[PDB]
Design an enzyme around this catalytic site. Structure first.
Site, PDB file in Angstrom:
ATOM      1  N   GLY A 192      59.660  43.118 123.271  1.00 45.23           N
ATOM      2  CA  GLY A 192      58.638  44.143 123.185  1.00 45.23           C
ATOM      3  C   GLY A 192      58.438  44.815 124.515  1.00 45.23           C
ATOM      4  O   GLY A 192      59.174  44.595 125.462  1.00 45.23           O
ATOM      5  N   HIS A 199      68.909  41.455 118.562  1.00 41.13           N
ATOM      6  CA  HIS A 199      69.983  42.426 118.504  1.00 41.13           C
ATOM      7  C   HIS A 199      71.386  41.873 118.588  1.00 41.13           C
ATOM      8  O   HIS A 199      72.311  42.629 118.848  1.00 41.13           O
ATOM      9  CB  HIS A 199      69.789  43.526 119.540  1.00 41.13           C
ATOM     10  CG  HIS A 199      69.667  42.934 120.909  1.00 41.13           C
ATOM     11  ND1 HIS A 199      68.534  42.363 121.349  1.00 41.13           N
ATOM     12  CD2 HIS A 199      70.625  42.877 121.911  1.00 41.13           C
ATOM     13  CE1 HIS A 199      68.733  41.933 122.617  1.00 41.13           C
ATOM     14  NE2 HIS A 199      70.012  42.257 122.942  1.00 41.13           N
ATOM     15  N   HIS A 202      75.226  43.375 137.534  1.00 41.76           N
ATOM     16  CA  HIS A 202      75.513  42.191 136.709  1.00 41.76           C
ATOM     17  C   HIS A 202      76.815  42.221 135.929  1.00 41.76           C
ATOM     18  O   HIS A 202      77.541  41.237 135.910  1.00 41.76           O
ATOM     19  CB  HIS A 202      74.425  41.933 135.672  1.00 41.76           C
ATOM     20  CG  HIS A 202      73.175  41.433 136.330  1.00 41.76           C
ATOM     21  ND1 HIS A 202      73.174  40.559 137.354  1.00 41.76           N
ATOM     22  CD2 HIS A 202      71.868  41.763 135.983  1.00 41.76           C
ATOM     23  CE1 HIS A 202      71.876  40.324 137.675  1.00 41.76           C
ATOM     24  NE2 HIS A 202      71.096  41.064 136.835  1.00 41.76           N
ATOM     25  N   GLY A 204      84.596  40.399 125.163  1.00 41.98           N
ATOM     26  CA  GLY A 204      83.539  40.480 124.151  1.00 41.98           C
ATOM     27  C   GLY A 204      82.199  40.911 124.720  1.00 41.98           C
ATOM     28  O   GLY A 204      82.111  41.951 125.350  1.00 41.98           O
ATOM     29  N   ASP A 233      66.225  47.420 126.660  1.00 36.10           N
ATOM     30  CA  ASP A 233      65.126  47.255 125.713  1.00 36.10           C
ATOM     31  C   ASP A 233      64.493  48.592 125.388  1.00 36.10           C
ATOM     32  O   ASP A 233      63.837  49.177 126.223  1.00 36.10           O
ATOM     33  CB  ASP A 233      64.092  46.291 126.314  1.00 36.10           C
ATOM     34  CG  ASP A 233      63.138  45.754 125.269  1.00 36.10           C
ATOM     35  OD1 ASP A 233      63.045  46.308 124.181  1.00 36.10           O
ATOM     36  OD2 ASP A 233      62.493  44.759 125.529  1.00 36.10           O
ATOM     37  N   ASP A 234      64.726  49.028 124.121  1.00 35.00           N
ATOM     38  CA  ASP A 234      64.106  50.263 123.679  1.00 35.00           C
ATOM     39  C   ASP A 234      62.634  50.183 123.275  1.00 35.00           C
ATOM     40  O   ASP A 234      62.044  51.140 122.807  1.00 35.00           O
ATOM     41  CB  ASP A 234      64.960  50.922 122.615  1.00 35.00           C
ATOM     42  CG  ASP A 234      65.324  52.345 123.014  1.00 35.00           C
ATOM     43  OD1 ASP A 234      64.673  52.928 123.888  1.00 35.00           O
ATOM     44  OD2 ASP A 234      66.261  52.875 122.427  1.00 35.00           O
ATOM     45  N   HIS A 280      71.285  48.392 138.549  1.00 30.73           N
ATOM     46  CA  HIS A 280      71.121  46.933 138.598  1.00 30.73           C
ATOM     47  C   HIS A 280      71.931  46.139 137.560  1.00 30.73           C
ATOM     48  O   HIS A 280      72.582  45.154 137.869  1.00 30.73           O
ATOM     49  CB  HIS A 280      69.636  46.705 138.428  1.00 30.73           C
ATOM     50  CG  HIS A 280      69.263  45.256 138.567  1.00 30.73           C
ATOM     51  ND1 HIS A 280      68.829  44.729 139.720  1.00 30.73           N
ATOM     52  CD2 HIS A 280      69.203  44.284 137.568  1.00 30.73           C
ATOM     53  CE1 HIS A 280      68.481  43.430 139.498  1.00 30.73           C
ATOM     54  NE2 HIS A 280      68.713  43.176 138.184  1.00 30.73           N
ATOM     55  N   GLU A 281      71.857  46.635 136.293  1.00 31.85           N
ATOM     56  CA  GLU A 281      72.587  46.002 135.192  1.00 31.85           C
ATOM     57  C   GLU A 281      74.088  46.085 135.310  1.00 31.85           C
ATOM     58  O   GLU A 281      74.774  45.118 135.005  1.00 31.85           O
ATOM     59  CB  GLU A 281      72.134  46.520 133.815  1.00 31.85           C
ATOM     60  CG  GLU A 281      70.644  46.348 133.483  1.00 31.85           C
ATOM     61  CD  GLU A 281      70.161  44.910 133.604  1.00 31.85           C
ATOM     62  OE1 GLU A 281      70.968  43.998 133.460  1.00 31.85           O
ATOM     63  OE2 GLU A 281      68.961  44.709 133.835  1.00 31.85           O
ATOM     64  N   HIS A 329      71.509  37.622 141.377  1.00 34.32           N
ATOM     65  CA  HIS A 329      70.350  38.100 142.128  1.00 34.32           C
ATOM     66  C   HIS A 329      70.356  37.824 143.617  1.00 34.32           C
ATOM     67  O   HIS A 329      70.745  36.763 144.102  1.00 34.32           O
ATOM     68  CB  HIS A 329      69.071  37.541 141.520  1.00 34.32           C
ATOM     69  CG  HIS A 329      68.825  38.193 140.176  1.00 34.32           C
ATOM     70  ND1 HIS A 329      68.301  37.557 139.110  1.00 34.32           N
ATOM     71  CD2 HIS A 329      69.083  39.512 139.830  1.00 34.32           C
ATOM     72  CE1 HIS A 329      68.215  38.448 138.078  1.00 34.32           C
ATOM     73  NE2 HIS A 329      68.698  39.632 138.546  1.00 34.32           N
ATOM     74  N   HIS A 355      69.209  43.630 130.113  1.00 34.51           N
ATOM     75  CA  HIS A 355      70.064  42.575 130.659  1.00 34.51           C
ATOM     76  C   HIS A 355      71.526  42.909 130.501  1.00 34.51           C
ATOM     77  O   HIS A 355      71.906  43.735 129.688  1.00 34.51           O
ATOM     78  CB  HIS A 355      69.752  41.184 130.089  1.00 34.51           C
ATOM     79  CG  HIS A 355      69.832  41.084 128.580  1.00 34.51           C
ATOM     80  ND1 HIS A 355      68.897  40.452 127.846  1.00 34.51           N
ATOM     81  CD2 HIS A 355      70.787  41.586 127.709  1.00 34.51           C
ATOM     82  CE1 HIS A 355      69.226  40.536 126.539  1.00 34.51           C
ATOM     83  NE2 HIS A 355      70.387  41.233 126.474  1.00 34.51           N
TER      84      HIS A 355
END
Ligand SMILES: O=C(O)[C@@H](Cc1c[nH]c2ccccc12)NS(=O)(=O)c1ccc(N2CCC(c3ccccc3)CC2)cc1
Ligand SMILES: [Ca+2]
Ligand SMILES: [Ca+2]
Ligand SMILES: [Ca+2]
Ligand SMILES: [Zn+2]
Ligand SMILES: [Zn+2]
Length: 168
Positions: free
Chosen positions: A77, A69, A123, A91, A99-100, A119-120, A129, A84
């Site tokens: 998958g 992507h 980040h 940028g 993840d779809d 969580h993301e 972590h 993430h």
């Protein structure tokens, strides 16, 4: 808590976000609710404020994708990596990808979008972590039997205030 190497952070406290696109799995209102809630967790404990952009380049671009992507980390998958996000910067930095090939839920049983998104965003704000098993920023995915019992740990609060300070 841990930050990222070189301690990347925002050097501004008014941040923008854009939800570039949407998962088939939930109505838009449920995704918006998860994102807003995910932002609010951090907003509450810092001077950070967020506003939405519906066009153009926002700080935190949020999107749903599969496999390749457009970055260095193609998704994989069903299962394994669920999402993430990149540390603060320009940028792609700051952006969060979901993840779809997971099935996103607002429930207790599947892959919970709010919990992953919170969580993301951590980040996206510069938290890496945590060793604390109770922390939002712990590296291994889990859910709760009761989603209403969610609370940001003191470890997470300490980490994010280490970057941005407490609320005014
Ligand atoms: O963001 C990730 O970690 C990416 C991608 C990823 C894999 N290596 C990495 C190394 C450095 C940075 C990112 C990654 N992995 S992942 O998709 O497997 C992932 C996603 C979410 C979580 N949670 C942890 C616990 C949590 C919780 C806490 C308290 C109460 C209720 C629920 C909910 C979210 C963990 C791991
Ligand atoms: Ca996956
Ligand atoms: Ca960005
Ligand atoms: Ca999906
Ligand atoms: Zn990505
Ligand atoms: Zn993580």
């Amino acid at each position: 808590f841990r930050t990222f190497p070189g301690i990347p952070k925002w050097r501004k406290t008014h941040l923008t976000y854009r939800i570039v696109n949407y998962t088939p799995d939930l109505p838009k209102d449920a995704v918006d609710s998860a994102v807003e809630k995910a932002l609010k967790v951090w907003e509450e404990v810092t001077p950070l404020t967020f506003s939405r952009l519906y066009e153009g380049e926002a700080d935190i671009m949020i999107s749903f994708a599969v496999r390749e992507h457009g970055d260095f980390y193609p998704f994989d998958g069903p299962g394994n990596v669920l999402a993430h996000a990149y540390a603060p910067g320009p940028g792609i930095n700051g952006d969060a990808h979901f993840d779809d090939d997971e099935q996103w839920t607002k429930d207790t049983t599947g892959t919970n979008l709010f919990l992953v998104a919170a969580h993301e965003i951590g980040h996206s704000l510069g938290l890496f972590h945590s060793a604390n098993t109770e922390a939002l920023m712990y590296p291994l995915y889990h859910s709760l039997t009761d989603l209403t019992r969610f609370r940001l740990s003191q470890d997470d609060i300490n980490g994010i205030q280490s970057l941005y300070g407490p609320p005014p």
